[PDB]
Design a protein around this motif. Structure first.
Motif, PDB file in Angstrom:
ATOM      1  N   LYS A 222     -24.002 -32.555 -18.354  1.00  0.00           N
ATOM      2  CA  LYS A 222     -23.875 -33.738 -19.206  1.00  0.00           C
ATOM      3  C   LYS A 222     -22.574 -33.709 -19.992  1.00  0.00           C
ATOM      4  O   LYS A 222     -22.025 -34.767 -20.320  1.00  0.00           O
ATOM      5  CB  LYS A 222     -25.037 -33.851 -20.180  1.00  0.00           C
ATOM      6  N   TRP A 223     -22.055 -32.515 -20.285  1.00  0.00           N
ATOM      7  CA  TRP A 223     -20.776 -32.434 -20.976  1.00  0.00           C
ATOM      8  C   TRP A 223     -19.634 -32.897 -20.085  1.00  0.00           C
ATOM      9  O   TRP A 223     -18.776 -33.676 -20.522  1.00  0.00           O
ATOM     10  CB  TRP A 223     -20.504 -31.008 -21.452  1.00  0.00           C
ATOM     11  N   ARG A 224     -19.602 -32.432 -18.831  1.00  0.00           N
ATOM     12  CA  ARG A 224     -18.527 -32.852 -17.932  1.00  0.00           C
ATOM     13  C   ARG A 224     -18.578 -34.360 -17.699  1.00  0.00           C
ATOM     14  O   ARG A 224     -17.559 -35.048 -17.820  1.00  0.00           O
ATOM     15  CB  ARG A 224     -18.581 -32.074 -16.613  1.00  0.00           C
ATOM     16  N   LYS A 225     -19.764 -34.904 -17.410  1.00  0.00           N
ATOM     17  CA  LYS A 225     -19.858 -36.350 -17.240  1.00  0.00           C
ATOM     18  C   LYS A 225     -19.449 -37.083 -18.521  1.00  0.00           C
ATOM     19  O   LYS A 225     -18.678 -38.048 -18.472  1.00  0.00           O
ATOM     20  CB  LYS A 225     -21.274 -36.742 -16.809  1.00  0.00           C
ATOM     21  N   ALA A 226     -19.896 -36.606 -19.687  1.00  0.00           N
ATOM     22  CA  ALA A 226     -19.567 -37.326 -20.915  1.00  0.00           C
ATOM     23  C   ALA A 226     -18.087 -37.223 -21.264  1.00  0.00           C
ATOM     24  O   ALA A 226     -17.588 -38.034 -22.054  1.00  0.00           O
ATOM     25  CB  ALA A 226     -20.412 -36.822 -22.088  1.00  0.00           C
ATOM     26  N   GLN A 227     -17.374 -36.258 -20.686  1.00  0.00           N
ATOM     27  CA  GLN A 227     -15.962 -36.089 -20.988  1.00  0.00           C
ATOM     28  C   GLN A 227     -15.096 -37.088 -20.242  1.00  0.00           C
ATOM     29  O   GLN A 227     -13.914 -37.227 -20.577  1.00  0.00           O
ATOM     30  CB  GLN A 227     -15.529 -34.666 -20.652  1.00  0.00           C
ATOM     31  N   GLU A 228     -15.664 -37.788 -19.254  1.00  0.00           N
ATOM     32  CA  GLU A 228     -14.947 -38.871 -18.587  1.00  0.00           C
ATOM     33  C   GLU A 228     -14.648 -40.017 -19.546  1.00  0.00           C
ATOM     34  O   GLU A 228     -13.670 -40.748 -19.360  1.00  0.00           O
ATOM     35  CB  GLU A 228     -15.762 -39.372 -17.388  1.00  0.00           C
ATOM     36  N   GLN A 229     -15.463 -40.179 -20.586  1.00  0.00           N
ATOM     37  CA  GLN A 229     -15.211 -41.140 -21.651  1.00  0.00           C
ATOM     38  C   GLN A 229     -14.920 -40.433 -22.951  1.00  0.00           C
ATOM     39  O   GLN A 229     -15.102 -41.008 -24.033  1.00  0.00           O
ATOM     40  CB  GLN A 229     -16.403 -42.099 -21.787  1.00  0.00           C
TER      41      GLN A 229
END
Ligand code: NI
Ligand code: NI
Lengths: 392, 400
Positions: A358-365
């Motif tokens: 979830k951190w990697r995905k949330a780092q896209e934004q």
């Protein structure tokens, strides 16, 4: 009232429960609710929320008895239950110290606040659904907005106490709940926060009564309060608080509170609870609100309110603001700041695999910091302590 | 008689024999160990013994003012000091709980008792001399005989109950030689009367009656202040237990002053509480006199004891009973003693399983020598008796 208040954000034949009974059911099965058993003799935030729910249904029964006009407008038992069982899920480990640590860590990324977190959990974080958290009914959500504005509008602890509101990263689900209100009602709600819905005013009084009274009995038996300091602080102020019932009965209430028998103290605690609870009425809010759920609030009679404020001030002065509790919160706030600092140093490496993803995905934004803050906010005290021991 | 200044065994040392006894006791390992036995409370058996010593010298001062007839007979400052510094030397780890365990484990070998242990330490165990312990003067030793009989004069059968194994009080038979030496300048008639029973001995020397009063006063009052601030007693319990009984105890000063004494004790200010404590202590001290003992003793140190005035005795007995009901006989203290007694019994059973292999080498050597007389168990008992709680906990961990 509009049936749009019974709606859910996303869409069996044998299940004939009301929408608020399904909301109560989801809140009870949630991980966010169960963890209140860890967060603090066995009085916990879970116990506090149960006691608040019992006072909240008692308030409603008492209002619909003396003000029949509102019998249809008042919340059902399961709605007032749901707001009292959910009201504290957003609190982080170590209470106010944990809140301060997170808010400071998140100072450049939207802050942290317990009420904001509660809204965030029920609309997104609790994994009951894929995208809408517990996906509660709209009126239930409105009841949870004790402060219906965003925080963009609203080692020293005083400086870092958070403002109260809803995270800007949750604006989409806030827009959804306020959607069936006319513009003018919506514009007022964010006025300074000053206003809240009828259901939420009832929940706040129930939290206030529970805080004032149910912490008090075990403080007497544990010896954290002596007979002399109860007389000097609480009992004398209650004699002059202006409410006749407390002025008349305080002396006999004090002899029951120090009886040394539980079945006598229970009578004192119940009588205080019953006296405060029977002193509430629904009045119109002083603002040109159109929606009936915003045009009426529940209010405690002013003099009884002074007595309640004497009781809350006493519980805070002799149960919370004592060095032994405050040192524990200092420790917790150092502990949380350690966890935040280590985890954000290398998130994809130290987070659990599910949270690291979830951190990697949330780092896209560029919202990675919020993923770390959610994760720490959802820890119990024991989980946070073992992670600290693992990292340090 | 100068025989009371004699010992069993420098130019510029012009101290009295009793000043030398005090210095030895102050320097002994046995005395230093009393320091071991979120607040800032540090009351130990050592501090208890300093307070008793200071009350003892105050008692002597009051008697030498009110009863000049007895100024030759009363103990010097350093003699009464020495008896109060030493009175608690023999206590084992874990207080009464340790005592019960050791006594039970010695049930077939003379038992264990703290006063007997105190006598054994100063006459033999403390290695100040090779063969006579601290080698104290005869009168000092006589002042330590709170129970001047042998345990042969003063069996239980059948998890352990405290009532069943509390030791009788007296002197170990294995220390009879040093007891015979202490009583040697007494006529036979005094000697057979000294071991007379009330089994519980009835009699003691004048110096020892004074120490007993000072000890009892220290126990009564100086525990009381910290019991109040630690919250171990509330104002209400003080009124029902102590203050009401003191209002009916029969002494006019206490009946007059109890109301004001109770408000001072719960003032919350150390500088006020100390005046209540000081007044209680002083009221008790000034009520002591020397009267004759009711037995036809011939020796002056046995013909007279110090006695507290009876109504004053009731007040002291109210205070002593009160500290026992709210400071000692509480479950928090009693569980620590149960644990200690389970701990002491474990150490004894392991160490007596094979003493040469498990004892420290120096104690192992003493055990081998003692087996020529089949007294090995007493060596194990001395060793456990001289441990602190921390040393016993560490030994227990090494074994279990
Ligand atoms: Ni609450
Ligand atoms: Ni003593």
């Amino acid at each position: 009232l509009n049936p749009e208040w019974l709606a859910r954000n996303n869409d069996r034949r044998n299940d004939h429960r009301s929408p608020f009974q399904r909301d109560r059911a989801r809140i009870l099965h949630s991980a966010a609710f169960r963890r209140l058993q860890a967060k603090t003799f066995h009085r916990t935030r879970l116990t506090h929320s149960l006691e608040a729910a019992q006072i909240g249904t008692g308030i409603v029964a008492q209002i619909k008895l003396k003000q029949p006009e509102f019998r249809e407008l008042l919340p059902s038992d399961s709605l007032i239950d749901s707001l009292c069982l959910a009201h504290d899920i957003g609190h982080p480990p170590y209470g106010h110290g944990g809140e301060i640590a997170l808010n400071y860590m998140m100072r450049d990324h939207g802050g942290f606040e317990g009420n904001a977190q509660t809204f965030r959990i029920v609309t997104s974080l609790e994994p009951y659904t894929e995208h809408h958290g517990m996906n509660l009914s709209r009126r239930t959500l409105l009841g949870l907005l004790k402060y219906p504005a965003l925080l963009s509008a609203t080692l020293k602890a005083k400086d870092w106490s958070p403002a109260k509101g809803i995270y800007d990263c949750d604006l989409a689900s806030l827009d959804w709940v306020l959607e069936p209100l006319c513009e003018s009602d919506r514009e007022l709600l964010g006025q300074m926060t000053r206003f809240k819905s009828l259901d939420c005013s009832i929940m706040e009084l129930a939290d206030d009564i529970a805080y004032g009274v149910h912490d008090l009995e075990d403080a007497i038996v544990l010896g954290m309060v002596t007979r002399a300091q109860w007389q000097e602080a609480a009992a004398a102020q209650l004699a002059e608080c202006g409410d006749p019932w407390f002025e008349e009965h305080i002396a006999e209430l004090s002899e029951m509170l120090f009886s040394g028998k539980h079945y006598v103290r229970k009578d004192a605690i119940g009588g205080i609870v019953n006296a405060l609870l029977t002193s509430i009425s629904v009045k119109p809010v002083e603002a040109p609100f159109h929606n009936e759920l915003l045009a009426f609030n529940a209010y405690i009679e002013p003099h009884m309110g002074n007595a309640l404020e004497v009781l809350k001030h006493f519980v805070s002065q002799y149960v919370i603001q004592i060095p032994q509790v405050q040192r524990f919160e200092y420790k917790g706030q150092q502990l949380i700041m350690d966890l935040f600092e280590a985890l954000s140093a290398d998130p994809e490496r130290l987070l659990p695999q599910a949270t690291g993803e979830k951190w990697r995905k949330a780092q896209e934004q560029d919202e990675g910091m919020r993923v770390i803050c959610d994760y720490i906010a959802a820890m119990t005290d024991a989980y946070a302590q073992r992670l600290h021991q693992q990292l340090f």
